[PDB]
A paper describes a structure:
The M17 aminopeptidases from Plasmodium falciparum (PfA-M17) and Plasmodium vivax (Pv-M17) function as catalytically active hexamers to generate free amino acids from human hemoglobin and are drug targets for the design of novel antimalarial agents. The M17 family of metalloaminopeptidases, often referred to leucine aminopeptidases (LAPs), selectively cleave N-terminal amino acids from polypeptide substrates. The catalytic C-terminal domains of each monomer are clustered in the center of the hexamer to form a buried catalytic core and are linked to the N-terminal domains by a central helical linker. Each active site has capacity to coordinate at least two metal ions, which are essential for proteolytic activity.
Data were collected from samples prepared in the presence of 1 mM Mn2+ to encourage formation of active hexamers and resulted in a map with global resolution of 2.8 Å that showed Pv-M17 in the conserved hexameric conformation. Map quality and resolution was the highest at the core of the hexamer and reduced toward the periphery of the hexamer. Each of the active sites had density for two metal ions, which were modeled as Mn2+ ions, as well as a single carbonate ion. The carbonate ion electron density was planar in comparison to the Pv-M17Δ125-151 sulfate ion tetrahedral electron density observed at the same position. The position of residues involved in metal-ion coordination was conserved between the full length cryo-EM structure and the Pv-M17Δ125-151 crystal structure despite the difference in metal ion identity and inclusion of the carbonate ion. The Mn2+ ions in the cryo-EM structure were slightly displaced when compared with the Zn2+ ions in the crystal structure, although this may be because of the larger atomic radius of Mn2+ in comparison to Zn2+. The carbonate ion bound in the cryo-EM structure active site was positioned 4.3 and 3.7 Å away from Mn1 and Mn2, respectively, distances that are likely beyond the physically feasible Mn-O bond length. While electron density for the Pv loop was poorer than the remainder of the hexamer, it could be modeled extending from the exterior of the hexamer into surrounding solvent. In its modeled position, the Pv loop is coiled and partially obstructs the substrate access channel. The Pv loop interacts closely with the substrate regulation loop from the neighboring chain and together the two loops appear to have capacity to influence substrate entry and product egress from the active site.
Numbering used by the authors:
A (entry chain E): 124 to 274
B (entry chain A), C (entry chain D), D (entry chain C): 75 to 619
E (entry chain B): 427 to 476
Write the structure that this text describes.
Amino acid sequence: SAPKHSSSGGSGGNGGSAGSSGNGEGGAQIKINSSVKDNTINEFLKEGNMENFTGKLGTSKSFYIANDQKKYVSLAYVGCGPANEETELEIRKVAYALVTLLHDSKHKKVSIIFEIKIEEALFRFFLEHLFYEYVTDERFKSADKSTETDF
Amino acid sequence: TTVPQVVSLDPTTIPIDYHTPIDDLSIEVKDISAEACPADEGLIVFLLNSAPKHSSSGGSGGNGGSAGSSGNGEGGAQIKINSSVKDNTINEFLKEGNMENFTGKLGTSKSFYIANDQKKYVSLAYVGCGPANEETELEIRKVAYALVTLLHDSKHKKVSIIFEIKIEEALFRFFLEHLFYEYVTDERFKSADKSTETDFIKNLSLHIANADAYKGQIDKARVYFYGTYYAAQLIAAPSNYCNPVSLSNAAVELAQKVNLECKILDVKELEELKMGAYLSVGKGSMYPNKFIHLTYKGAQTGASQNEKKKIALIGKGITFDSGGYNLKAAPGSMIDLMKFDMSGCAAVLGCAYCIGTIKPDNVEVHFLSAVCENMVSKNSYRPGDIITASNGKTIEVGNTDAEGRLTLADALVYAEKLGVDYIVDIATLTGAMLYSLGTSYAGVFGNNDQLINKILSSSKTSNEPVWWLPIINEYRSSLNSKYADLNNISSSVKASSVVASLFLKEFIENTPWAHIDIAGVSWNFKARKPKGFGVRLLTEFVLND
Amino acid sequence: TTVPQVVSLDPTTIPIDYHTPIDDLSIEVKDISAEACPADEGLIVFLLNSAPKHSSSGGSGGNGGSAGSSGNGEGGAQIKINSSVKDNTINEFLKEGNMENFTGKLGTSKSFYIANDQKKYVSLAYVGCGPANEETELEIRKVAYALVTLLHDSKHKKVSIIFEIKIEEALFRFFLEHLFYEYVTDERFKSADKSTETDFIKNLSLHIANADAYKGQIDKARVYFYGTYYAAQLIAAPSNYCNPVSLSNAAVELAQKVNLECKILDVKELEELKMGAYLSVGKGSMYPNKFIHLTYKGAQTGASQNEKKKIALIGKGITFDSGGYNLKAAPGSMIDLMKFDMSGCAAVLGCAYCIGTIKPDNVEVHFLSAVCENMVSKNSYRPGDIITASNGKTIEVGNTDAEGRLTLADALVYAEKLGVDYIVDIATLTGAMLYSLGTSYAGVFGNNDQLINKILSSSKTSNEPVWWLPIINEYRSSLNSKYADLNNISSSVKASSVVASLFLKEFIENTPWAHIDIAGVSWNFKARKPKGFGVRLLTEFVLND
Amino acid sequence: TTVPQVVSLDPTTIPIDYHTPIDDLSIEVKDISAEACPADEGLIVFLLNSAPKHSSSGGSGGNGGSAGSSGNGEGGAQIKINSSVKDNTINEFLKEGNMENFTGKLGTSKSFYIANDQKKYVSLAYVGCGPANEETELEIRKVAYALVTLLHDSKHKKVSIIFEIKIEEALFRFFLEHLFYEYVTDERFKSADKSTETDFIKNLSLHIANADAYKGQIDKARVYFYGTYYAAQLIAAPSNYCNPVSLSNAAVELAQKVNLECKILDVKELEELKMGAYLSVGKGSMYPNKFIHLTYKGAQTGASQNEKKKIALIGKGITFDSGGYNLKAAPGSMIDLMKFDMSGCAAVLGCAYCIGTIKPDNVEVHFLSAVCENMVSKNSYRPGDIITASNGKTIEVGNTDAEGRLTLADALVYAEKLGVDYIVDIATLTGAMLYSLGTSYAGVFGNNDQLINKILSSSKTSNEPVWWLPIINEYRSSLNSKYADLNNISSSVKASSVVASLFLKEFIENTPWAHIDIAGVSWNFKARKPKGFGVRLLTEFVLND
Amino acid sequence: YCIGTIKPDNVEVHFLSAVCENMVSKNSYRPGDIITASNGKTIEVGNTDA
Ligand SMILES: [Mn+2]
Ligand SMILES: [Mn+2]
Ligand SMILES: [Mn+2]
Ligand SMILES: [Mn+2]
Ligand SMILES: [Mn+2]
Ligand SMILES: [Mn+2]
Ligand SMILES: [Mn+2]
């Protein structure tokens, strides 16, 4: 999340409550990206296509868009919360929002971009909880048994 | 009339939004044989049926219909968008499908912003509806819920929905109404996120096959939606906001703007009608008892071409139900949700709005409700008290928490003296409806088979699930009292809904009567909000007489 | 097979009376056109209706017909005039002013020993039936109950009953059956009061108007009485007498005396059928699991006379239901009455007797029942266990007290593999039926409307009240399990009967199926005895197919 | 202001003893290097540690100072009082050990009247303290309890206590205070047993080693004792004596006698502050809502000597807690002890006495408390009501028994507008603290680590056990409401204290804040009296700023 | 009634009864209240149902 201490669409905290209606001047969530393509790597780049994201926590926005050659790529945005208020609860919620995007068999190759500043232990924990949410337990099902090769 | 206050910070009015964002929504229905939507569009949704094969090797198929081969899972086919959207270099992508992992079970949407012939992103979407012709009201509710979760992105001022499914016209109307009901949120009691901005939708273009048979449902869906939303707004209001006087004022103000004859009765004129059972329930409250009596008189289009059906609709109308001295102390008593015990009255008032707007002909509806509170105080009625109703029968109050059937008894005796043909009451009477029909069907009892058949035929059209339940005259002696004429509860019978209708059947003399028990279906427990159940059912009942 | 014993004083058999006082009771039906009764016959009963209507103050019958000029009771004279001069010319000298102050509301008998023509006393009586045409099954039950209380005087070896009421033929048959059921007493478990004596009746004359339309119901009433009496004898037997082994032995004996194909399945052949859900319930018992499979093959009276309907009737069959590790410890759990949890199996066995005696044509019935106990021990199944049914689906046991639907699931998968047209399960499944329909109506669920209509039309004739209840597919996702295919109970739905029917609907593939929930209507709580519910219903269903 | 009365025998004041036996008790501390006590004395006590023996196989010495140590009760030594005594009739009566039975575990007193130089019996005694250095607050409480049971003999006007144990100075002060607290008895509500007599002590000599480091604690112990005794007198007063009006009168009187600025706020000025959450709780009472606001302004000893710390201390103050419409009906609800629900307010008032007497410098404390009742009547607030706090947030009342956090919310919004550096609440908030820390430790929550460290460091010195508990922001979404800003209780989280702290954290904007949950540690259940918990803790917190 | 009708001799009966209700209101006595009787003894109300 870009802004801080405002109340028109979110909660503040009064670390300075000088207006900021709609966050007022807290800004957008423009990303410092280097995605090499042009079509789907310019809007999700310097340009602005952040229509209603407002990344509270979870609240993803997946979309299959064609990246400069062909082949809709399904770029996505996932919300993590304020800039440095990242704890294990935030990481668990983000991993849960991210595996709900991964449950589409169309993806055999995934790229995750960390525009957030987190520790190394928290990075390890993000990886582990991503794996833990991704892998499902199917040992006691009659149908739904033979795990497909779409991971 | 003035609402009594304990402190000066008490509320004096129910806040009501008489103007919804749906009033500004411009809707239009075009035949699916010419779309031309995506070129300069904002959002496009596709409702697609799943294609489950003769059996599922992992696809959750069910039975062996005409075969049981079940190859490749359920590989009988794959979903393909059988309509092209005339945006010529868009409909190309429509013929290619690009259906990567959709498998439209139910809900399970896939929002995606493919670019148009401009660096604009349209956010085309696909929403799953289920098998090809197994579309009921549950499917429609789930699809509307999945579709409003895509609408909560303020980027869209013009939505466009494409119906690749084959549904009825009543189901189409119900889809529209439930879409509106999910879309509009209640923000009357918030402090932040209060002032609504310009983020809502301004256009809604629906594309369906044979659209001229559907474009008569638009105005009916707007009226039905607002009736349901008004009712849900009354139910969701807390009891420090919705008291008997506040609700009386709301009914007056509603009848003022739908041009109904309002007539509120006070305790002075309730004592002259001998309404002792209704008065004993409201004794122990700080708010006076208010009896609402609205009236819609249709325009006589035919002197003898028809007969003027006179109907009386009655609601429970208990703004808070603590149980009285039989206090709701047990586990699972749901005393925190007992603000919804006026759901029948709210349904009657919503249907009053609906019928004052539609204005049917050759009909006369009486909208009755005995509003009161069931509170504990020193003026409360006590378990064991003997009260006299308006027809003369004496009732022993074996349970102060069975208070709705007393106010309904007095209201029924009042309704029979008006001279109506049908009496239909609707009430959140018994908590036993949750163990019998659950949270999806409302039970209907009665003393006339033609009236119950009319109510069921109107439940078909309005898509409000009603199931006919029996009035078992074998438990009638369990209401026998040693000293009074009746007891209000059963001694050693646990079918509380059947006993409640047996009790209420003793106050109807010679009139066709039915009772709709909505105790289980009023509150949506998972969403924590009211459903507004009953408005569309009662409206479609009145309109088809 | 041999019943296991903990101590040598354990019982090894269910005591069954195969010969009732009714077997030697000579019945006869003669037209009321000639009585010739009073020649010294121990008892003479008169069934008389209430004379007036539409009044109150001692004859309260609601309002709606005239409601005017009651004066001193009813609007008219309000006294009954007995026809049927009783062909003596000196007993008809008593049809003048007896005037019958009993005013026969319902029951209200009045016995009296007038003298006939010499110094013997005939004990003529009058019994009240109610209004002149509002005669239902409840009235008939109450009249039979009042009439046996006059029959418990050993002075009567001959009885004459006079029907001055106008009733149907099916209701006349039901009156006969319920009279027999009230008359005979269960004396199998007494120490004194054991040796039955001559005191029973030896003749029974029934005088009815146009009796030739009724005298075909006599044999059917005898067969139906004994089927119901056999079922009630099985249900009334305690669990140290009625265990799975004793019950399978009783079924073998029954099939021997009515010439059915008996086939009991032991645990060895149930393990090869993969009946894991039925075996897990019976794990923690000291008695082996027994699967009864009787078969009636009707005589093919014609090759292409009809289509041979093949029916499978299934009963629950849990000889004792403790709850397992979800022990029945809560108040109102009725654990001392849980011997009645084999009422479905007992109804199926009584119907087996009825159909083996009647021997219909062009029908093939399969009488299935998976018999076990639900005990607490160290070998019992636990809450959370995952078991596999015989069709493959795994089931998570979220509640060990929901054990009837698991054994019924396995029995249903077995019945579907026989190749039948209809499956009808009957079971005391959910204790929630007591809050939905109470103790008088059984609820029927199903997946086919023609089969449910057949069951309702056969409940009309057998006079066993059945009410059609809905299978609500909205609650199907509350049976979803994280690890198994289904859970056996619902997370956050209290409609227990609808959820049980949803669970059982998952084990039927492509067959018309219905399920009768008799949990509430099989035990007569006021009389502390079983009703035998379901025998006549199932028999009339089979006989009309 | 005047206390309202239902009957004329209603009490109109809280009886308070402003003069205790301790005020007349002359205390003196002299070094143990010269006792000279028993020369013309009345009572002498000796506090002696358990003599260390071994890994005791004769009493279970506990852990492994040695493996087994081969001691078994006689491991290393026995006890010997090696300090002094003056009169050598008894001085040389204990020099030869003379114990022979003692083994001073904990408590375990042995009083005995030996003559000395007269026939005067002096009643020298011995009290056990435990191991030689494991002296904590629990040991000191037990020793003081055993020592007052020897003081309840009126023969003693002089007492000498000999400290042969090695303890700190804060623990010596705590010993003095708890001795005084056990000694004085509350006799305000007796009929006999009222008129206190001369029997109390008039002198108290304490002989300790290096006594000049201890004789500064005497005045602090007297002030702390009276603060705790005042608080316990308020808590022990029943609710017909301690109502909001009586309590605000008591606060006015206290502020008058310790020279604080009293300021009581009535309902008129609370309606203008928009304190709707605090007024809704007190709606249904017969007593008006009172808001106590005392103020201590320390003498600015220097202009820029320090920064003048401004502290706000807040107490819960619910003179009787019935639960409201969520009545305390369940078992173990302790509704007869709910008079102690003003223990936070009483601790704040006792601390007000302590700080008005000590008069620290460079500090400004605000003693706030929102006093009301939580009663059931016809004017009370109901479950589901939506109320507005004085900062604008709306609150849905999902439970009327969670009333302390609403009044605390309003008091916190009031305290933040004063402009303080620290806010500290103290409240008997959640009955769940009994399952988490029991009856000995109070839990402290907070939003600042330096403030919590200050509270813990002041619990070290005051010897009131406090344990730091976490505010878990993961449960914040369980307080989300559909219609209001927050709910006052949690949907599906049972950690009630963490949820209460999460709720209160929503009404603090930018101020260091901490909250002490004393629900479990304020009532001594075994002695059936209040502890007075929190007075010494809050005083030592304020004095060390 | 029976004794006013029979009218026995050499007897004097006092028929006493303290009539009241035990209701829940905002004027009710609470669990824990301490009340004084007519002989002076104070009573702690540990249970309002007794
Ligand atoms: Mn109620
Ligand atoms: Mn109610
Ligand atoms: Mn069970
Ligand atoms: Mn069972
Ligand atoms: Mn409380
Ligand atoms: Mn409290
Ligand atoms: Mn009592």
